[PDB]
C-alpha cells in the first residue's frame, strides 16, 4: 500500500483533497509521488534522454547514468525530473518520481479573442537555466507548438497546443533547455494580469480545515 | 616559444629585411 507520511498526503489518501488545484492554490509542498499519482491518474511520462556522467577516481570512470523525464497530462500540468543513478532503469524510475513531485500548473490563455477553451499562453514568458534562455510567445490557433522537439514534447505534455518559441544560449544542453522551458512554463501563473487584479478572500488551507490528520491512535 | 621572444625574433627579422631592401635599389 501507501501508508502515508506527509499529512498533506494523509488528506489526499483520505479523500479530503480531491484536486491538485487546491495544493497549487495553497502552495502545499508535496513530498510523496503518490499524492500526484492519485490526484492526476492520467499522467504520462516521456524520457527525454539518458546520458553517462563520469567521475575520475583511480582508473576513473565511475560512469553514473543521468535521465531527464517529463511527466504531464495534456491539460494544465507538467513536471520535470532529472536524476542520476547507477543504472539507467533506476535512474528513470527515480526521475519519474522527481518529475511527479515537481509537477506544477501552467496558465493557458488566448492569443486573440475569447473563443472558448484556451489554446495558447496568457502572456509572453521567459525561463533561464545556465546559458539557455527559452521564451514562450502566445500563438494563434493552428500555429502548433513552434519549438525544438524536446521543448515541444514538454509543451504538449503541458497541454499547450499553440505557442511560438525563441531560444538563446547553448540549447544543445538538453537539461538546461528543458529546465529553462519548465521555468518559462511555471512563470505563467506568476505573471499578474488585469483579470487577476481582483482581490480574493484568501481561503483557508485544507490542512487547517481537516486538522485531525496528524496523530497515531 | 614565449610571445616576448617571438616578438624579438620577428623584430630582428624585420631589421634584416629593411637592411636587405636598403642595400638593394
Amino acid at each position: 500500500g501507501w501508508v502515508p507520511v506527509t499529512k498533506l498526503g494523509r488528506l489526499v489518501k483520505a479523500g479530503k483533497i480531491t484536486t491538485i488545484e487546491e495544493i497549487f492554490l495553497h502552495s502545499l509542498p508535496v513530498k510523496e509521488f503518490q499524492i500526484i499519482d492519485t490526484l492526476l491518474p492520467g499522467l504520462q511520462d516521456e524520457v527525454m534522454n539518458i546520458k553517462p556522467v563520469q567521475k575520475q577516481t583511480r582508473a576513473g570512470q565511475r560512469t553514473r547514468f543521468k535521465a531527464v523525464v517529463v511527466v504531464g497530462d495534456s491539460n494544465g500540468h507538467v513536471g520535470l525530473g532529472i536524476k542520476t543513478a547507477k543504472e539507467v532503469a533506476g535512474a528513470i524510475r527515480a526521475g519519474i518520481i522527481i518529475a511527479k513531485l515537481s509537477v506544477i500548473p501552467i496558465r493557458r490563455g488566448y492569443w486573440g479573442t475569447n473563443l472558448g477553451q484556451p489554446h495558447s499562453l496568457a502572456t509572453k514568458t521567459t525561463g533561464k537555466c545556465g546559458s539557455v534562455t527559452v521564451r514562450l510567445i502566445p500563438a494563434p490557433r493552428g500555429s502548433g507548438i513552434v519549438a525544438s522537439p524536446a521543448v515541444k514534447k514538454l509543451l504538449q505534455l503541458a497541454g499547450v497546443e499553440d505557442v511560438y518559441t525563441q531560444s538563446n544560449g547553448k540549447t544543445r544542453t538538453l537539461e538546461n533547455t528543458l529546465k529553462a522551458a519548465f521555468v518559462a512554463i511555471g512563470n505563467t501563473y506568476g505573471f499578474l494580469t488585469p483579470n487577476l487584479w481582483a482581490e480574493q478572500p484568501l481561503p483557508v488551507s485544507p490542512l487547517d480545515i481537516y486538522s485531525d490528520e496528524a496523530s497515531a491512535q | 616559444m614565449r610571445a616576448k621572444w617571438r616578438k624579438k625574433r620577428t623584430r630582428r627579422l624585420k631589421r634584416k629585411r629593411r637592411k636587405v631592401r636598403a642595400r638593394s635599389k
Binding site: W111, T123, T193, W197 | -
Partner: protein
C-alpha cells in the same frame, strides 16, 4: 547628465515596484512625466501620485499598488505610424489583451488603444503592463 527625466522616473518606479515598495519619489517631475503617470493611473497600474512643488522642477510621490509588471520608455521617441503601432505593441506588450504602448500625439499623450480609436499617431513614448 540627465537626458530623459521620463526615463529616470519610470526607472525609479520600476525599481520600487520590483523591490515591493508601495511608494516612490521621482525628481524632477516634468509635464510628460505627469501625463504618463495619468495614463498609468487611469489604467490602474499606479495609485495616487502627489506633486511636491519646490520652486525647482518639482518632485512626485507615486503610490504603487503591485499591479505594475514593467513601465519603460522607448528612447529615442521613434516616429510611429498608425500601422507601426501594431508592430510596437507586438514587440513590447506581453499579450494582445492587456498592456499599453504610450505615445505622444498632437491629440495629446495617450495609450495606443485610444490612439487608434481617435485615429491619431505620433511618437512612441513608453509602455506599461
Amino acid at each position: 547628465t540627465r537626458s530623459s527625466v521620463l526615463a529616470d522616473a519610470l526607472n525609479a518606479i520600476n525599481n520600487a515596484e520590483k523591490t515591493g515598495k508601495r511608494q516612490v519619489l521621482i525628481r524632477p517631475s516634468s509635464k510628460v512625466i505627469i501625463k504618463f503617470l495619468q495614463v498609468m493611473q487611469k489604467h490602474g497600474y499606479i495609485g495616487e501620485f502627489e506633486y511636491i512643488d519646490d520652486h525647482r522642477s518639482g518632485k512626485i510621490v507615486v503610490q504603487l499598488n503591485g499591479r505594475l509588471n514593467k513601465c519603460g520608455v522607448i528612447s529615442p521617441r521613434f516616429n510611429v505610424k498608425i500601422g507601426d503601432i501594431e508592430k510596437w505593441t507586438a514587440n513590447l506588450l506581453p499579450a494582445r489583451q492587456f498592456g499599453y504602448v504610450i505615445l505622444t500625439t498632437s491629440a495629446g499623450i495617450m495609450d495606443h488603444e485610444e490612439a487608434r480609436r481617435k485615429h491619431v499617431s505620433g511618437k512612441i513614448l513608453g509602455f506599461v503592463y
